[model samples]
Target: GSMSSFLGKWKLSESHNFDAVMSKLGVSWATRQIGNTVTPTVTFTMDGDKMTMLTESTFKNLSCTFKFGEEFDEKTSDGRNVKSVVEKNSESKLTQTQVDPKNTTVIVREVDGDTMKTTVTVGDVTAIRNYKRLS
Candidate 1:
């Protein structure tokens, strides 16, 4: 499931369900209800204890990187895993307490059939993203 195929660069192919997320963000109607949505490509890659996610969203284009074991480990350490929460290399300008419980760039691998689900948090909202192997 992971192929870890979800690894590598992936451009946003379609945003069929992304409009809702944009609408929820309170984007202006002019920006929210548009004929052609600029599909910004996002890349996700993982190697051993390292994970990286790069996104070129309508709002910003940024990259986040995280290293487990070398920095922190929930398996051998005390803190809960942050991978299931945020995107890799993602950040927040808000206070630490304002961060979503599941918002960090650390990724935990989970497989169901042919789908691989990686949980992600943007701001305070959390979502589970599933990807099928293409490589």
Candidate 2:
């Protein structure tokens, strides 16, 4: 749907089952431990059909810019090269799919006013990360 609802800063408030997601991605125990503890801030930007997101955390930061429906190359924080695509589902929901030779991951983001909910699924393990609007 409309992108305006997502164009702002959102600070992570809670996370669950993230370690399992990282483990499925072949992340090491050390990295998964850190990934389970950090609160990441995400900022969204848009220029026409292009969407850019910056994910900030103490352990690692990632920035990606792409347009919906466009399959693009992406590198995971764990260093895996993958193909990913993001698509809008409705006025407040977006879905992204990431795939590599060994794995496939799906992430859905939905926003309702000041809160954003992210659902990450890898195999049978599902992770939830919630954020609150910052600006």
Candidate 3:
């Protein structure tokens, strides 16, 4: 199955170890402060085989569109340029890996019912962000 379970608007409910992960990812102190405090809304759009994820927040807004298993250039909200490839790990999980010049970041998202748990890993640091369905 294609990512049908993850098609919805999700609101950030909690984030754990995000600051440490940001620091490991080379984010500045001011940006990390802003990133840690803002709750982002993530909306997923899927049309046929194409996908788009829009992350909107008070501090920054980021959107990415690509097909599954395809490589695309992605610019992070903090202005880091990276190449990303997204693929489905399982029926309930999707993984996206962003390769930067210095490091590789892995994002794993698992959906269960109305809750989705996203884990971001950069180097040895890992952060978990939980989101709840809003619609």
Candidate 4:
């Protein structure tokens, strides 16, 4: 089997501080009122340089596929998920086009396991998702 450094089924822990961010966003009445009752999590599947990321919470669901070290597209499917190429740059810096019914270029910094911080950008909005490796 092909092994990948970032591959595997990973779970989103409480460390992301996503709960606080989402709760502040005031996601819809249904999710806001009763949401956050459970743990929000995401599963990432990495194949070679490409990766598929999915975010699921009490209020929202999102998914995106990325082709690392190569150019690809992203678009939206199932209403909210992206399914088209968002960016295609050399490496290091790139754009993330979101496919949510309408298309938009969501620029962001690629997550670096070696880095202490990561910036996930969508359009002009930027959110920092930082982490420290733990075994």
Candidate 2 lDDT over residue span 4-32, tens digit each? 89999999999988888878888888888
TM-score, per-candidate, Cα-based: 0.43, 0.94, 0.96, 0.43
User: lDDT for each of the candidates?
Assistant: 0.41, 0.89, 0.91, 0.44
In candidate 2, the residue pairs with backbone N, CA or C atoms under 3 Å apart (3 or more residues apart, or in different chains) clash, namely 1-90
Model 3 RMSD in angstroms: 1.0
Error of 4 at 119 (Å): 2.7
- How far out, in Å, is residue 114 in model 2? 1.4
Return the top candidate by TM-score: 3
How does residue 57 of candidate 3 score in lDDT?
97
**Poorly placed runs, candidate 2 (over 4 Å):** none
Q: How many pairs collide in each candidate, listed in order?
A: 12, 1, 0, 11
What are the per-residue Cα lDDT tens digits for candidate 3 across 21-135? 8898888888999999999999987888898899999987888898978999999988899999999788778899999998899999999999899999998889999999996
- Model 3 is weakest, by summed lDDT over 10 consecutive residues, at 1-10
Write model 4 residue lDDT over 1-135, tens digit each, in one string: 222333433343323333443343334545544443444444556566666767566546666666754445443322344445545343333455544444343534343553323353444445455433334
For candidate 2, give the lDDT.
0.89
